[PDB]
Amino acid sequence: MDVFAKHAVSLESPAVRHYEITPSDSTDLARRPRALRVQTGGTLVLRDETGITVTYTVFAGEILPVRPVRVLATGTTATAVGWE
Amino acid sequence: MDVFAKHAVSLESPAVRHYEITPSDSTDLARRPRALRVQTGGTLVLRDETGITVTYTVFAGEILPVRPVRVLATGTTATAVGWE
Amino acid sequence: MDVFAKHAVSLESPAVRHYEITPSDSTDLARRPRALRVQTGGTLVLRDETGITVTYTVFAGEILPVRPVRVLATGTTATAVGWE
Amino acid sequence: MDVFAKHAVSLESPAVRHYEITPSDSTDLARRPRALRVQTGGTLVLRDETGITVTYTVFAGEILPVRPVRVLATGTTATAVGWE
Amino acid sequence: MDVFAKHAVSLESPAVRHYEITPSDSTDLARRPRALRVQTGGTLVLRDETGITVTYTVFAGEILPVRPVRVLATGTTATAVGWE
Amino acid sequence: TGAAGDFAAVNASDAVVDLVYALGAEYRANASFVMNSKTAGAVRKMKDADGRFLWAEPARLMGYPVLIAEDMPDIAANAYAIAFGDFGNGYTIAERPDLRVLRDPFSAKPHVLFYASKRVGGDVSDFAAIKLLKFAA
Amino acid sequence: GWASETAALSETATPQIDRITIPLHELAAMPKASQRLLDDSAFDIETW
Amino acid sequence: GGYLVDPQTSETIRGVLRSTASLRQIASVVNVEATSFDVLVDKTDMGSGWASETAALSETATPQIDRITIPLHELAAMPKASQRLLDDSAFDIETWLANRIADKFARAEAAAFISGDGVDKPTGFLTKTKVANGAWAWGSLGYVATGAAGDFAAVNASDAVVDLVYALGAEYRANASFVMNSKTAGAVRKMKDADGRFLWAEPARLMGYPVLIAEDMPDIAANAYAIAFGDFGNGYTIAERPDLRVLRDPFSAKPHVLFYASKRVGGDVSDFAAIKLLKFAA
Amino acid sequence: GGYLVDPQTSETIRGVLRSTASLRQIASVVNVEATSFDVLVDKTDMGS
Amino acid sequence: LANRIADKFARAEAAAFISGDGVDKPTGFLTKTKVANGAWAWGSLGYVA
Amino acid sequence: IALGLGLGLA
Amino acid sequence: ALNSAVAAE
């Protein structure tokens, strides 16, 4: 029983569905996430829809509100789970 | 006396009612929370309405804005209190 | 001179007025706060309008967006200041 | 070139203009800030428009979304920069 | 496949496009960012559209929701990536 | 609609807007939603993320009439609880526009035992003019 | 067709026809009233 | 006894009611019984001086003229109805086909006014050598691009539309209209603000200007032009013969009737400044 | 036989349609057949 | 030509009604020595920034 | 992201 | 609108 059903889920709203991401490198994500809950600390790389992709020196419990298209595997040492 | 009565409580709004969660592992939560205030550190598992359920390596004072349907007890070593 | 006067103060908006809370344990708060800026670390207890009251193992600089009716004094070892 | 021009700057929106605050103690702030980016750690005191003023045991990188009228100098050991 | 397409990207919304910033000192940023994901810790300087520019003693994983026009290079010891 | 019980969790109000635009601009000239009472209520209880209602006497919805027909199924597992279409062409009713009553003072003797029976019938005539909204997936 | 000037226009399609039957059923109600009531009950019970 | 029933038939043979939105209700229809319509436009303007008292006026420029040729092609259908049917079929088949043929013509020429090429069909305004607006010439339609390749812009959505409106000139906007298909007006209706409540508040108007829901504009593709906006009352001229010449031929296929119906219709853009488009490229 | 057709010209010569929003329809137009016009306004008011 | 000149005149006199100066053409309402509103005299047009 | 107090995602 | 023999036409 959710009292917050019939509310529209916006981008600023909390995470409704989650899925662990695997750094495919060559294909985009199946769904692009609103945020990334990082599982373990490390460096991981993220790509926009514009190709600009950079490396993030992320921390373990860090949750970063970036919305990526593709997560590559070359510089990725940190596993994450995408929130949506 | 609340001056913020007559304001609608949205998903992004602060927590109005709280309840400690027990990892039933076979039944859903009585109310699904907007967020989880973690009581003690550990790993705990959370399920969407889509079944995707993953494990979160959460920290003690961490408050994670994920909205789960069921909190299982198999991998759960961290007690939490749900916010709503 | 505030340029953000004539803006309505919502629940998600920053804190306009603050007041230090004392754990009365028998009376409700004079105003219920939007959030609690914790002064010193410890455990403190908070009650909803539904009576559900639990204990929070809070940290020193932690600021927790829970909106309580009554702050009791039995398990309260942490002083806070309410934001509104 | 800002793509987010023509968007109205609300209270919840990011900081557009910043200014370092000096604890005058006898005059109000020239502009009251939406938040306070703390420069160095310490204790600093903040006053509402209601006079309630308390002391905050703030930390170095802490950013606290309180909107004060006057920042006094008696208990202030922490320098901040106001965001607006 | 994004389920949150057709949603308008506001200032409070998560980061859609990112770009690493270089402290030009003499020219403005190509796009002014909504926030700054700091890459490595240090001090870095940021300028408004009003010229007020101050120095921020930022930390490594810190993400600061300030919206600057120009990032100068004189006091900048911390590399960042702008979010937008 | 997406979810099996109710509207889509991620983005509702789109299973309604594509239900409208799944008809054709000719049948949308005069079409109308058909719901029961507690469904138009569940549509009106729909609020966006801020808490305001997304759909702001004939109970018109999105500019089109609404017929509160108490006989449609409610929101359920696989129910078609909301139908939208142009029934002026889609559903043909064949009837006799009079009620024939026969009072019968003979069968039950101290009573009168009226007997009234109009004749009516009808099914769909244009399958292209009625679109439904299944709540399953 | 978008016929040309010199094209020797050939046959074109023809809409096919479907007939739908409406069996036109009937709907019956048989209420029973006492003859004593129909005489003593100034409201017209016949027409009610 | 069941043989004594004789089910009653309809009065008129009904039919599936397909879309009649044809761009013909907003464009400039001109009845001409010729082989071409030559509309004359003035692609330029005059000059004025604010003369003095002793100015000794010189020549002021005179508008130069452009001629557009509407080739006025034709559209023909020939349904072969049997003769045993035409007399045994208490409905009126002769006037049903004529009513049904004119329906198919108003629906086949509707697609030609939009995406019709030049070969024996009206040149739709979408095949008119589109140029990016701002670098606008006279022999081309000016478009504004949205941003991302597939959908609208990722950040300032609905701003590629609100400037598409204000890129058309103050005088054509007085009576203009959007043109989309059913699947694009849905993709526009689903656009929603940062909260989820869609940001666009019987003509199905958008931003106050009417919307003609065609069914023949391209979908929202990589570089398609799914949304057009302009004063087609001045921007598009239709030339036609406002009748339907039905020649029934009981001669060729002898035991049949072989109705030969044909209308003549044409049309190109008359004013390249009166129609603005929306490309989804960049 | 294509020389025998003679395309039909329009009835009137159309033109590119330019903005007629002139500020003339919201101002006070006064027909004056002279070299000048002298409006006489009162830049102040009386006192009670 | 008369329909086309009467148009160009309605469009050339409309430009002078806004930004046209005094020389041989109507003085538009923009060329009237604007002064900040609050410091509003009579021989000037008030504006807000 | 920005200066609200709301337990939200961003 | 074809042969009156085949019912579908």
* CA atoms of H184 and H178, how far apart (whole Å): 11
Give me the numbers of helices (H) and strands (E) for chain B, helices first please.
Answer: 0, 6
Q: Does the beta carbon of H83 lie under 8 angstroms from any beta carbon of chain L?
A: no
Phi, psi of H182 (to 5 degrees): -65, -35
Copy the structure tokens of residue H234: 């001045």
Q: Does the beta carbon of B18 lie under 8 angstroms from any beta carbon of chain C?
A: yes
Copy the structure tokens of residue E74: 């004189």
| Residue H130, burial from CB neighbour count under 10 angstroms (0-12, 13-18, 19+) | middle
Question: Do β-strands B35-38 and B80-83 pair in parallel, antiparallel, or remain unpaired?
Answer: antiparallel
Tell me the nearest-neighbour CA distance from A20 into chain F, angstroms: 18
Tell me the nearest-neighbour CA distance from J13 into chain H, angstroms: 9
Breaks in chain K after residues, C-to-N cutoff 2.5 Å: none
* CA atoms of D83 and D28, how far apart (whole Å): 16
Q: Does the beta carbon of A32 lie under 8 angstroms from any beta carbon of chain F?
A: no
Q: Does the beta carbon of F18 lie under 8 angstroms from any beta carbon of chain H?
A: yes
Which among B11, B58, B59 is the nearest to A13, CB-wise?
B11
Structure-token match 């909205």, residue found: B67
Which among H36, H38, H63 is the nearest to I15, CB-wise?
H63
CA F26 to chain centre: 20
Write out chain K residues lying below 8 Å of C83, CB-based.
5
Which among H154, H192, H196 is the nearest to A49, CB-wise?
H154
Question: Do β-strands F66-68 and F32-35 pair in parallel, antiparallel, or remain unpaired?
Answer: parallel
**H191 within 8 A of E6, measured Cβ to Cβ:** yes
In chain B, whose CA is at the least distance from the CA of F8?
Answer: B49
Phi, psi of H174 (to 5 degrees): -60, -40
**H198 within 8 A of H226, measured Cβ to Cβ:** no
Ordered DSSP codes for H241-282: -SS-EEEE-SSSSTTB--EEEEEEEEEEES-TTSEEEEE---
In chain F, whose CA is at the least distance from the CA of B9?
Answer: F51
* Residues in Cβ contact with I36 at an 8 Å cutoff, skipping those fewer than 6 apart: none
| Residue C45, burial from CB neighbour count under 10 angstroms (0-12, 13-18, 19+) | buried
* CA atoms of A11 and H159, how far apart (whole Å): 20
Mutate to test the interface with B, among K3, K5, K7 (most CBs of B within 10 A): K7
Largest CA distance in chain B: 43
Write out chain F residues lying below 8 Å of A16, CB-based.
9-10
Write out chain E residues lying below 8 Å of A66, CB-based.
14-15, 18, 37, 83
The b-or-e profile of A5-31 (16+ CB within 10 A means b, else e) is bbbbbbbbbbbbbbbebebeeeeebeb
Cβ–Cβ below 8 Å for K6 and B15 = no
**D38 within 8 A of D14, measured Cβ to Cβ:** no
Cβ–Cβ below 8 Å for A8 and F6 = no
Write out chain F residues lying below 8 Å of H189, CB-based.
17, 20-21
Secondary structure string (H, E, C) spanning J3-47: HHHHHHHHHHHHHHHHHCCCCCCCCCCCCCCCEECCCCCCCCCEE
* Residues in Cβ contact with H8 at an 8 Å cutoff, skipping those fewer than 6 apart: none
Which among E1, E13, E40 is the nearest to A11, CB-wise?
E13
F120 bridge partner residues: F95
What sign does the dihedral F16-F22-F24-F27 (CA atoms) show? negative
F67 bridge partner residues: F34
- The full length of chain L comes to 9
* CA atoms of A68 and A74, how far apart (whole Å): 16
Phi, psi of F22 (to 5 degrees): -105, 15
Q: Please, which chains are in contact with J (at least 3 CB pairs closer than 8 A)?
A: H, I
Q: What is each CA distance from B35 to A13, A61, D12, F39, H35, in whole angstroms? A: 11, 16, 20, 30, 74
H28 bridge partner residues: H237
Cβ–Cβ below 8 Å for H50 and J25 = yes
Write out chain E residues lying below 8 Å of H190, CB-based.
6
Tell me the nearest-neighbour CA distance from I16 into chain H, angstroms: 6
Cβ–Cβ below 8 Å for B31 and A1 = yes
* CA atoms of H39 and F26, how far apart (whole Å): 32
Copy the structure tokens of residue E75: 């006091």
In the three-class reduction of DSSP (H, G, I as helix; E, B as strand; rest coil), residue F65 is classed as: coil
In the three-class reduction of DSSP (H, G, I as helix; E, B as strand; rest coil), residue C37 is classed as: strand
- The one-letter code for the residue type at H29 is V
Structure-token match 């903040």, residue found: D46
Mutate to test the interface with H, among G4, G6, G14 (most CBs of H within 10 A): G14
**H196 within 8 A of A10, measured Cβ to Cβ:** yes
Helix (H) or strand (E) holding H28: strand H28-31
* CA atoms of D67 and H21, how far apart (whole Å): 57
Cβ–Cβ below 8 Å for J11 and I23 = no
Cβ–Cβ below 8 Å for K8 and B12 = yes
Write out chain J residues lying below 8 Å of H65, CB-based.
none
* CA atoms of H218 and H184, how far apart (whole Å): 9
Q: Does the beta carbon of E74 lie under 8 angstroms from any beta carbon of chain H?
A: no
* CA atoms of H216 and H269, how far apart (whole Å): 17
**D4 within 8 A of E11, measured Cβ to Cβ:** yes
Tell me the nearest-neighbour CA distance from F108 into chain G, angstroms: 8
**L5 within 8 A of H86, measured Cβ to Cβ:** no
